[PDB]
Design brief:
Member of the NMDAR signaling complex that may play a role in control of AMPAR potentiation and synaptic plasticity in excitatory synapses. Promotes clustering of HT2RC at the cell surface. The protein is α+β, with helices and mostly antiparallel strands and about 110 residues long. The protein has three helices and six strands. It has a single domain, classed as Pdz3 Domain (Roll), CATH 2.30.42. The longest helix has 10 residues. It is globular, with a radius of gyration of 13 Å. The protein starts with 7 loop residues before the first helix and ends with a strand.
Length: about 110
């Protein structure tokens, strides 16, 4: 585990059954992300719709448009409005840890 209780074992146990590919990354902050989604949708509840190419996420280069955000710093993002998820991200300290899933055709 890290400070949020995150390990690859743990996150695989929680989310390993979802269709798509699970990821976890750490970034230093802002992140320069635009989010969209629907609170009540059962997949794609909060997802990335924009990445500032000059901001922390863009420079890092691992996050991609349409990536579905599950958690940041121990807080669950799905089932909540994208604005609430954006607020959580904005209020977070510099160091962030993000669990997300990517949904490729093939």
């Amino acid at each position: 585990e890290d400070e949020f209780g995150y390990s690859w074992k743990n996150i695989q146990e929680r989310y390993g059954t979802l269709t798509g590919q699970l990821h976890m990354i750490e970034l230093e902050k802002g992140l320069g992300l635009s989010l969209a989604g629907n609170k009540d949708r059962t997949r794609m509840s909060v997802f990335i719709v924009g990445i500032d190419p000059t901001g922390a996420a863009g420079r890092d280069g691992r996050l991609q448009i349409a990536d579905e955000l599950l958690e940041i710093n121990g807080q669950i993002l799905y089932g909540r409005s994208h604005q609430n998820a954006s607020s959580i991200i904005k209020c977070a300290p510099s160091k962030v840890k993000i669990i997300f899933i990517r949904n490729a055709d093939a």
